[PDB]
Amino acid sequence: KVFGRCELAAAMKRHGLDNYRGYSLGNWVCAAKFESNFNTQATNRNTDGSTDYGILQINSRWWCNDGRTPGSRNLCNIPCSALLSSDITASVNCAKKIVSDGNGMNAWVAWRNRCKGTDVQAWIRGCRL
Ligand SMILES: [Cl-]
Ligand SMILES: [Cl-]
Ligand SMILES: [Cl-]
Ligand SMILES: [Cl-]
Ligand SMILES: [Cl-]
Ligand code: NA
């Protein structure tokens, strides 16, 4: 599923991401835009053989099991394919664990390079929330 901007904002708000660990909703929408272009089915392989999955590009090196990342962890206790669903629940719940692990949203390279320090409120401007 390719979300619209305000559609995704509303779904992320319903799932408790607005101001989660102090990160306002626009931060999460901005991260999703540049990680996946709002596409739940996005995948990208990494140099070390791990793969990033879904709207927030969560990495099989640490967070999910895809059966093809030897020596990795599965800290969200899910198959990586669950992060590709049109229902964003699994991605949101895993993202909550990630952002709580000490490094905040710096875990998302695209957030650090394209959202951090910008006017992220623009990503939810005009949306009925
Ligand atoms: Cl957009
Ligand atoms: Cl915001
Ligand atoms: Cl594996
Ligand atoms: Cl949902
Ligand atoms: Cl933080
Ligand atoms: Na894994």
Side-chain angles (χ1 to χ4, degrees), residues 60 64-73:
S60 67
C64 60
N65 177 239
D66 63 5
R68 57 149 285 122
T69 312
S72 63
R73 300 298 183 114

Side-chain angles (χ1 to χ4, degrees), residues 2-83:
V2 180
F3 278 82
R5 177 181 61 91
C6 291
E7 189 188 15
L8 178 65
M12 289 178 150
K13 184 169 183 191
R14 184 191 146 61
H15 285 94
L17 284 182
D18 189 8
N19 297 320
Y20 189 83
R21 294 280 288 198
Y23 287 93
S24 64
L25 190 58
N27 282 283
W28 297 101
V29 176
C30 185
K33 171 65 179 184
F34 293 126
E35 289 289 350
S36 70
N37 210 8
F38 297 148
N39 182 3
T40 65
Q41 294 197 78
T43 59
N44 286 289
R45 179 122 324 121
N46 300 314
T47 52
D48 65 359
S50 62
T51 301
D52 294 343
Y53 294 87
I55 199 166
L56 283 172
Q57 287 292 279
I58 293 166
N59 194 342
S60 67
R61 171 63 59 196
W62 298 103
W63 305 106
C64 60
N65 177 239
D66 63 5
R68 57 149 285 122
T69 312
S72 63
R73 300 298 183 114
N74 179 13
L75 292 174
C76 291
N77 293 296
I78 52 169
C80 299
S81 58
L83 305 170

